[PDB]
Amino acid sequence: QYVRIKNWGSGEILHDTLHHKATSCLGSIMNPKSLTRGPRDKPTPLEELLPHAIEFINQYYGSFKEAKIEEHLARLEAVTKEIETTGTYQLTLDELIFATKMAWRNAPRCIGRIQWSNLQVFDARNCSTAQEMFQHICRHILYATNNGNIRSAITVFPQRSDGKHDFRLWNSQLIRYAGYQMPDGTIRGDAATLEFTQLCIDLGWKPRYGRFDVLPLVLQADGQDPEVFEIPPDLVLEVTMEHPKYEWFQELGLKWYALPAVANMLLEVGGLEFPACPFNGWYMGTEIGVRDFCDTQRYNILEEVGRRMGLETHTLASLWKDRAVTEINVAVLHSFQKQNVTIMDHHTASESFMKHMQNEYRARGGCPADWIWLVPPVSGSITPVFHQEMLNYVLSPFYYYQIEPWKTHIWQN
Amino acid sequence: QYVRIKNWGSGEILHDTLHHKATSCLGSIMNPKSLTRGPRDKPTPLEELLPHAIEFINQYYGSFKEAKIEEHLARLEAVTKEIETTGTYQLTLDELIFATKMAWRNAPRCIGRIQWSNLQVFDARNCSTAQEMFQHICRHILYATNNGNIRSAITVFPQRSDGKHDFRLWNSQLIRYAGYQMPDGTIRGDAATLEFTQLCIDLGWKPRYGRFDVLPLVLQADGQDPEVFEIPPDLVLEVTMEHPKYEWFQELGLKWYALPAVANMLLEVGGLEFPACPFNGWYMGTEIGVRDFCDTQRYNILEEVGRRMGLETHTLASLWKDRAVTEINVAVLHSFQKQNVTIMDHHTASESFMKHMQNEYRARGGCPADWIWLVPPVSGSITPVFHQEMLNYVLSPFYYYQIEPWKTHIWQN
Ligand code: HEM
Ligand code: HEM
Ligand SMILES: C[C@H](O)[C@H](O)[C@H]1CNc2nc(N)[nH]c(=O)c2N1
Ligand SMILES: C[C@H](O)[C@H](O)[C@H]1CNc2nc(N)[nH]c(=O)c2N1
Ligand SMILES: O=[N+]([O-])c1cccc2c(Br)n[nH]c12
Ligand SMILES: O=[N+]([O-])c1cccc2c(Br)n[nH]c12
């Protein structure tokens, strides 16, 4: 019938029926196969493609306020013919737009989903070369940034045909800092991008050997070898970190790019797969302040900010780590707000998601949600999301992870 | 072969093989059936009991440094005879001790598991009346408290025979505060214990209508009706909350009991079930400071502590909630330390668990772990546990949840 869901903070109860439409214990696995859509060397079998296509065409037309039956049946016929005569089909622009938003709506790990219907779509399915890709990605970055007034957008490249002509971005994110394995045993920049920074070098990128060196776009088009392209500095907007009280904070010489843009995910819709569809929204403070700046595998600036504050950084029970991390978060929020760059704190983000969740249950009886990702990296139980029981399931359309390109790519020269 | 586990903070990899011995997507469900062992009206079927018994007897003897084969085979024979002639069997004291520690060792939701081998066991299997139960529980509380130098202990009551003579504690925890639905629409005390506080009243308990009113032990013995017993105040040690800087903190008039003792769980071992086996360890600061004091469904003192600090408690982006919660945590840790009562901060707890996890993988190739519970309610990613991929599975011996007694109990008079 349905699965009962309870919120322990407010006591509210919800009835999840949406999970019945799911596709298919692995507790806290980061990249499980269930969330990964790998490569192919052959086209999608027709017996599989068609049911998926029809099911999507039904979902699309069944989403209008007032149904348009005539067009619905006609699209059903045309789609079938297209598959019969070409082996695959082309989505109409409206269907693609609808698909990108739904896939976002169905992202279990996204806290910003209340914004799902507000997405700019850049149709780059006609694209054919890396240079054209690069031009599209620049247009994206420029539009999305909007001089600090960040706008959510997505750029869709040509769908996978036989799997040997995949368009792919080798970058994890569009804008991302380089990480170098410095001489003195240390690490410079972003330690998370170590292996990738090297790959860029192995392809002719000039390592400016620093701290906040924006890495280059590594683009693969039509299954061909990846080409390195440096991002025009004018396009990369950054925020300089300043604390509203600790003047010594700017002495840390920290900053971060204002554009969070996922670049390596695959968009699945109606049997079709889009191995290249970079998308972005805006930042949530804790991502920068807590994960980027404080993870030990990242910038790891925690102890340092502790000392400058004069905390007993040698006694854990003093809760010094709790103290520093909050000041860093305050810095981030203050800096973005001052420099007129869109930012959202985790508390406001949570309430926003909660409101969204409630809208989703009223609108379609469910909201796929991954508690482990939806709960902020700090002040967990202080946010409403923590007390909300959730159901994690994979719907369609959906944004899947992909196997890293350098592991499967067959080189030409 | 095995499941690969990775820690994203340190990069370490672990191979989980222990999950193969497990008994048997529900994301963040609080009380799932997989963790609940319900009631019975008939004895455990022999075809089921015996394999479970033999398997436990093998585990027990197979845990010694140097095996004692002779005794092992003899116990196997005797156990079989006992089941053949009585329909069930009695654990030896050593086996029970071993079982209680293993079940703790196998508690996926416990962060304090590094202490698993340090458990005092009180054999109360000979118990037969509520008065005797009450006396045992008092001896427990007194021993465990040890005048602030908290000691981990467990008291085992008679095992379930036919399910119609179950020994059960109706209390969630041994020491717990009452919650009253005051006149003025508000709530007094602990809002979590509302329904239960009433039940105590419906059984003759005198509602002292306050804030920190220690509730009474509601004991069910031999399947008979529950009897109410007030806990001797001298036994209940408490800590008064004091901030080392904000002198106005004591004006809040807050405190908390120093003894965290789970009272409603069922111990499962070798086919046998113990519906009454209260146990305790020591507190982890955030439990009191964050959950008990700050959950909106609990004491909800967050805004109040914010005001006293002079924070913009009307602007979420100011991160005022993050500020208050940390001071409360500092208060708790400071108070317990000052009053010489055992307490542990969440940072030290995490490192402790991490060390434990590593010992467990080296010792037996696994450690059942529930990430959702193991990660502190604040400073999530700041703790090592957050970056540790985990596997959640149910082993045996194990501590299960039970269906609340008032929902299934058949009243006599
Ligand atoms: C408008 C503001 C948005 C905010 C504040 C937001 C925030 C976030 C956050 C905090 C995460 C977790 C990231 C991490 O920890 O690695 C996330 C994940 C995700 N978001 Fe959103 N998001 C927004 C817009 C979008 C858009 C426009 C899309 C897609 C059309 C999207 C798709 C996703 C997906 C697929 C993930 C998973 C990424 C992964 O698994 O690594 N988000 N987002
Ligand atoms: C020595 C110190 C110990 C510490 C610091 C510790 C701490 C904790 C914490 C923080 C939780 C989560 C509680 C909650 O959020 O409701 C927990 C759960 C648990 N602990 Fe430990 N524990 C300790 C000892 C013990 C002992 C001695 C046992 C049993 C023999 C035990 C059994 C469990 C079980 C079964 C749970 C799950 C409770 C539930 O699901 O509601 N703990 N413990
Ligand atoms: C091991 C664990 O799954 C991993 O470290 C997580 C957990 N929660 C997360 N939540 C978010 N938002 N982002 C993340 O990267 C992670 N990583
Ligand atoms: C909904 C969610 O499962 C619930 O609120 C949780 C999550 N994490 C927890 N973790 C601990 N330690 N204790 C808890 O009570 C909970 N409750
Ligand atoms: O805001 N964030 O922290 C954040 C993190 C990771 C991916 C995205 C996207 Br797409 N929008 N916002 C994001
Ligand atoms: O320390 N704690 O926060 C805590 C919470 C809940 C149950 C227990 C036990 Br048993 N020991 N410590 C506990």
CB B225 within 8 A of CB B413: yes
Question: CATH number of the domain that A26 lies in?
Answer: 3.90.340.10
Residues of B with catalytic annotation? 110, 113, 282, 287
- Let me know whether B60 and B48 are in one domain: yes
What are the φ and ψ backbone dihedral angles of B212, each rounded to 5 degrees?
-130, 55
Q: Is B48 exposed, middle or buried (0-12, 13-18, 19+ CB in 10 A)?
A: exposed
Is position A67 within any domain?
A: yes
Within-domain flag for A380:
no
> C-alpha angle A397/A398/A402, rounded to 5°?
140
Residues sharing a CB contact under 8 Å with residue A175, sequence separation 6 or more, in sequence order: A141, A214, A231, A236, A257, A259, A261
| Cβ–Cβ < 8 Å for A309, A248 | no
Q: What angle do CA A292, A298, A303 make, to 5 degrees?
A: 90
Residue (of B158, B154, B174, B171) closest to B279 by Cα position: B154
3-state secondary structure of B92: coil
Residues of B in contact with A27 (CB under 8 A): 369-371, 389-392
Asked whether the beta carbons of residue B319 and residue A326 sit closer than 8 angstroms, the reply is yes
Is A9 within 8 Å of B296 when comparing Cβ atoms?
yes
Strands A266-269 and A272-274: antiparallel
Q: Which of residues 250-289 of A touch B (CB under 8 A)?
A: none
Helix intervals (H) in A226-283: none
**Resolution at which this structure was determined, Å:** 2.4
Q: Return the residue of A nearest to B24 by Cα.
A: A25
Technique employed here was X-ray
Amino acid at B310: G
| Nearest residue of A to residue B350, measured between CA atoms | A316
Instruction: Select from A345, A183, A32, A321 the least CA-distant residue to B312.
Output: A345
Helix (H) or strand (E) holding A309: helix A302-309
**Both B111 and B12 in a single domain?**
yes
Ligand 3: residue whose CA is nearest its atom 9: A373
Residues 6+ apart with CB under 8 A from A333: A285, A289, A343, A345, B317, B319
User: Please, what's the b/e burial string for A129-160 (b: 16 or more CB within 10 A of its CB; e: otherwise)?
Assistant: ebeebbebbbebbeebbeeeebebbbbbbbbb
B-chain CB neighbours of A389 within 8 Å are 27-30
| Judgement on whether residues A139 and A250 belong to the same structural domain of the protein | no
What burial class does residue A77 get, using C-beta atoms within 10 Å of its C-beta: 0-12 exposed, 13-18 middle, 19+ buried?
exposed
Does B61 lie in the same domain as B173?
Answer: no
Is B413 a domain residue? no
B282 CA: nearest ligand 2 atom = 2
Contact A294 B382 (CB under 8 A): yes
Domain that holds residue A361: 8-125+152-162+266-280+350-374
Same domain, B49 and B157: yes
Residues in A closer than 8 angstroms to B386, CB to CB, are 377
Residue A368 lies inside a defined structural domain of this protein: yes
Q: Is B244 on the interface with A (CB under 8 A)?
A: no
Q: Which CATH number does the domain housing residue A301 bear?
A: 3.90.1230.10
H or E stretch at B130: helix B130-145
B227 bridge partner residues:
B219
One domain for residues A229 and A290: no
Contacts of B316 in chain A (CB under 8 A): 345, 347-348, 351
Q: Is A127 a catalytic residue?
A: no
How far, in Å, from the CA of A386 to the mean position of ligand 4?
7
Give just the sign of the alpha carbon dihedral A334, A338, A341, A342: positive
Burial class (CB in 10 A: 0-12, 13-18, 19+), B185: exposed
Side-chain-side CA neighbours of B289 within 13 Å: the count stands at: 33
CATH of residue B229: 3.90.440.10
Distance CA A70, CA B89 (A): 73
Which among B394, B116, B86, B96 has a CA at the least distance from the CA of B281?
Answer: B116
- Tell me how far apart the alpha carbons of residues A289 and A291 are, in angstroms, rounded to a whole number: 6
Q: Does B310 touch chain A (CB under 8 A)?
A: no
Cis ω for the linkage preceding A377 (within 30 of 0): no
Is A179 among the domain residues? yes
By the 8 A CB rule, do A52 and A42 touch? no
Point out which residues pair with A155 in neighbouring strands: A122
For residues B327 and B359, membership in a common domain is answered with no
B390 to A219, B108, B225, B400: CA distances (angstroms): 35, 10, 42, 20
C-alpha dihedral (A274, A275, A280, A281), degrees to nearest 10: 60
Are A26 and A82 contained in the same domain?
Answer: yes
Out of B326, B351, B372, name the one closest to residue A322 (CB).
B326
Q: Do A381 and B378 touch (CB under 8 A)?
A: yes
Query: What does the longest C-alpha to C-alpha distance in chain A come to?
Result: 72
CA distance B393 to chain A (A): 6
Q: How far is residue A131's CA from residue B183's CA, in Å, rounded to a whole number? A: 72
Supply the DSSP symbol for A369. -
Q: Is B392's Cβ below 8 Å from some Cβ in A?
A: yes
Tell me, yes or no, if A354 comes closer than 8 A to chain B by beta carbon: no
Residue ID of nearest Cα to ligand 1 atom 36: A110
Rounded to whole angstroms, the Cα distance separating B157 from B53 reads 19
For B322, phi then psi, to 5°, come to: -65, -35
Residues paired with A239 in a beta bridge: A256
Query: Is A256 a member of any domain?
Result: yes
One domain for residues A79 and A31: yes
Say yes or no: B107 and B204 in one domain: no
Residues B27 and B157 in one domain: yes
| Count of structural domains within chain A | 3
Taking alpha carbons only, the member of B329, B319, B323 closest to residue A347 is B319
Q: Please say whether the beta carbons of A263 and A141 come within 8 A.
A: no
Q: For residue B76, what are the contacts with CB-CB under 8 A and spacing of at least 6?
A: B54, B57, B58
- Ligand 4 atom at minimal distance to the Cα of residue A6: 1
Q: How many residues does chain A have?
A: 413
> Which is it for strands B179-180 and B188-189: parallel, antiparallel or unpaired?
antiparallel
Assigned domain for A3 exists: no
CB A392 within 8 A of CB A108: yes
Q: Does residue B381 fall inside a structural domain?
A: no
| Contact (Cβ atoms closer than 8 angstroms) between residue A224 and residue A130 | yes
Q: Which atom of ligand 6 is nearest to the CA of B280?
A: 10
- Judge: B378–A29 Cβ closer than 8 Å, yes or no: no
Can you list the alpha helix ranges (DSSP code H) found in B146-188?
none
Please tell me whether residues A93 and A205 are part of one structural domain: no
